[PDB]
Design a protein around this ligand. Structure first.
Ligand SMILES: *[C@@H]1O[C@H](CO)[C@@H](O[C@@H]2O[C@H](CO)[C@@H](O)[C@H](O)[C@H]2NC(C)=O)[C@H](O)[C@H]1NC(C)=O
Ligand SMILES: *[C@@H]1O[C@H](CO)[C@@H](O[C@@H]2O[C@H](CO)[C@@H](O)[C@H](O)[C@H]2NC(C)=O)[C@H](O)[C@H]1NC(C)=O
Ligand SMILES: *[C@@H]1O[C@H](CO)[C@@H](O)[C@H](O)[C@H]1NC(C)=O
Lengths: 50, 296, 237, 100, 32
């Protein structure tokens, strides 16, 4: 349940939903925000697996 | 080698996309501005606001625009949070002069346009309304004014150019009256003929963010894996009839893990459950390539 | 004045349906057992015809009244409230709830034989009408919040048995959400027995029913037991 | 607009860089050379196109694009020439001066 | 490939990179 809940975390991003990031921001800014979400989700997966 | 191996996961892909938005309310009063008994003057300008629900295809169909140029994408109906519509009837020699950074005699003494505004200037032949050549009251702008105007200078405050060999108060000898027949009298019926001109700035971005272009809705598809967008809430899933009892103000629901599992149809108010499209792992069972190439 | 023992004002923080879950959220709520001012002072005639106090609007406010006479007619929200700045006026009627946002210099009321005349208005930009259509004894609770340019009004009307504040838990459903876009720092109550409290940032644990209603709530910083409940996310410890 | 990830009439219909772009964009104010007193109409910009531009594609078609529900030949009320010339003059402000 | 198809494995090498910049949806083969 924790791992699923982590999908709703922003990790500092303006939004947790990738489609919102892609819709409102130009590719460059969207790429920065998405890369941040990717980092946060990878950290959550590493924690879960450990 | 002989064994069972974990490979890439499988998904069931959607076959179509659906977009659902609530019933479209009444539209911005663009029709009243263009489909008018008498056109508005520079001082009698309108301010379209808020069930505006702008839709710009009605203007493309309503009248044969001949000099319609949009600084922003002329096709896009998008947002603005305000529409500052303005109107006037002008000679078809000065229509090209209704633009940022242009001067001539017009704009300097009538409706100066600032740089960096969405100047979606529109224009069409007005001879059908100004058919008599005497002169028509309805849409007088300012042909001449004493001094050059700032961008968006007040149109409500009108004047007569104070020209002369002595100080002029407005009307007087060798002063230029804005209500001389001027453009309104067609004469030739080409060229100089009065052209109905509408210009909407679209340039006020502010905290409310209200007025924007109509949002299209597709038919609703159930019992299939589809992509969806419900009032900005997007995703992939299978939509089915719900037994959930939503409150009159709730638009969607969530699970114990804060994921979306239900939506309210914007038009029918039916509650729909969202089941994820099937997925799972794929395992490949092989005797090993040193015995046989048959796999399961 | 300085009433306390209140445990009410919880409202649905969003429009998300939840079924048999406990949801922990941080938002602006009226704290439980907070100080709520009881308005004696402006009851009955009060200071009417002579004065009318203006209260601050700090983040958002809680308003409640039990007066069946419908003497309470509306609210004005804004800053200067003298036509120098834009302000929001909400006035109720028998069958017409009217919201207008524009500059006003004043309104109608600075015995009860006439009302609804008003004075003047100019350069008006926003109007909204009849969200609930309407608005034998009933308690009428309202929450007025102004965040991110949106003016959010929540309300609930419930029957009473003649008691002042009958006990039980009832959450306020949202009524209207308008993109007004104005700065609200003060407000005033218009009369033709009301309570005013203030919202503060707080974390609450809200208990949702099978049918999506909220039946209880815990103010997470009220006492150490409530804090424990939020740590476990349970109403049983 | 001449940068990766940007939008606008040129980035979308005349000249577009890829989002993954390595290189240099150099701009210079050419008002003294390109702007004619009466207006220099040799430079054309595309404003009406059916599809958005793909990276480094150079589409020089001048076919009439119709924005209405009925195609027509030649110029028409909803039938527009896809290019719009811009008349650069020494008296335009910096935002409207030509740049090389 | 100077050695029907023997089905032997081979691979192609880069030859030229032309900045044509065009849509290239369709094509024809030119024969003498
Ligand atoms: C607006 O919403 C209403 C529902 O609130 C739609 O009306 C329904 O339309 C279906 C057919 O599509 C009928 O079977 C229902 O009986 C209608 N119900 C009511 C209450 O009218 C309506 O079609 C929507 N669109 C418009 C333009 O009104
Ligand atoms: C490359 O050519 C193809 C084929 O002409 C273009 O595809 C067309 O795009 C328009 C855009 O509205 C459609 O209306 C046509 O139906 C498409 N043709 C089909 C489906 O055969 C394509 O857009 C061109 N590429 C670019 C970048 O313009
Ligand atoms: C939910 O609504 C149904 C409607 O028939 C009712 O039977 C049920 O008791 C309700 N549940 C609650 C918890 O109110």
């Amino acid at each position: 349940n924790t791992l699923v809940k982590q999908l709703s975390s922003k990790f500092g991003a303006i939004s947790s939903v990738l489609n919102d990031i892609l819709s409102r921001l130009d590719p460059p800014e969207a790429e920065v925000q998405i890369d941040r979400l990717i980092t946060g989700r990878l950290q959550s997966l590493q924690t879960y697996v450990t | 080698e002989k064994g069972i191996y974990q490979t890439s996961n499988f998904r069931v892909q959607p076959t179509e996309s659906i977009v659902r938005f609530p019933n479209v309310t009444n539209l911005c009063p663009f029709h009243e501005v263009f489909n008018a008994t008498r056109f508005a003057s520079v001082y009698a300008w309108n301010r379209t606001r808020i069930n505006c629900v702008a839709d710009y295809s009605v203007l493309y169909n309503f009248a044969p625009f001949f000099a319609f140029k949009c600084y922003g994408v002329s096709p896009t109906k998008l947002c603005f949070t305000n529409v500052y519509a303005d109107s006037f009837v002008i000679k078809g020699n000065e229509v090209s002069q209704i633009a940022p950074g242009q001067t001539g005699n017009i704009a300097d003494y009538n409706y100066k346009l600032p740089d960096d505004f969405t100047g979606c200037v529109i224009a069409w032949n007005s001879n059908k309304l100004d058919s008599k050549h005497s002169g028509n009251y309805d849409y007088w702008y300012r042909s001449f004014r004493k001094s050059k105007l700032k961008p968006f200078e007040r149109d409500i405050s009108t004047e007569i150019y104070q020209a002369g060999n002595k100080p002029c108060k407005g009307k007087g000898p060798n002063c230029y009256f804005p209500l001389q027949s001027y453009g309104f009298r067609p004469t030739y019926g080409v060229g100089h003929q009065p052209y109905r001109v509408v210009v909407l700035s679209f340039e006020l971005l502010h905290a409310p963010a209200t007025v924007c272009g109509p949002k299209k809705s597709t038919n609703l598809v159930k019992n299939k894996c589809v992509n969806f967008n419900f009032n900005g809430l997007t995703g992939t899933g299978v939509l089915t009839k719900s037994n959930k009892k939503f409150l009159p103000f709730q638009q969607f629901g969530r699970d114990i893990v804060d994921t979306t599992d239900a939506v309210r149809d914007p038009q029918t108010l039916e509650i729909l459950d969202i089941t994820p499209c099937s997925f799972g792992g794929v395992s490949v069972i092989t005797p090993g390539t040193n015995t046989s190439n048959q796999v399961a | 004045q300085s009433y306390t023992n209140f445990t009410r004002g919880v409202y649905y923080p969003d429009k998300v349906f939840r079924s048999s879950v406990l949801h922990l959220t941080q938002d602006l709520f009226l704290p439980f057992f907070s100080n709520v001012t009881w308005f004696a002072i402006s009851g009955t005639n009060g200071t009417k015809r002579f004065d009318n106090p203006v209260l601050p609007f700090n983040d958002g406010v809680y308003f409640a009244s039990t007066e069946k006479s419908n003497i309470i007619r509306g609210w004005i929200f804004g800053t200067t409230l003298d036509s120098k700045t834009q302000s929001l006026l909400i006035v109720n009627n028998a069958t017409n709830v009217f919201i207008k946002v524009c500059e006003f210099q004043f309104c109608n009321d600075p015995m009860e034989s006439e009302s609804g005349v008003y004075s003047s208005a100019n350069n008006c930009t926003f109007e909204y009408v009849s969200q609930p259509f309407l608005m034998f004894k009933n308690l009428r609770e309202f929450v007025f919040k102004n965040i991110d340019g949106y003016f959010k009004i929540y309300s609930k009307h419930t029957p009473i048995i003649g008691r002042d504040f009958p006990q039980g838990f009832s959450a306020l459903e949202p009524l209207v959400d308008l993109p007004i876009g104005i700065n609200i720092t003060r407000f005033q109550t218009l009369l033709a027995d009301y309570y005013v409290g203030y919202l503060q940032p707080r974390t609450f644990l809200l208990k949702y029913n099978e049918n999506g209603t909220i039946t209880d709530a815990v103010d997470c910083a009220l006492d150490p037991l409530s804090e424990t409940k939020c740590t476990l996310k349970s109403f049983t410890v």
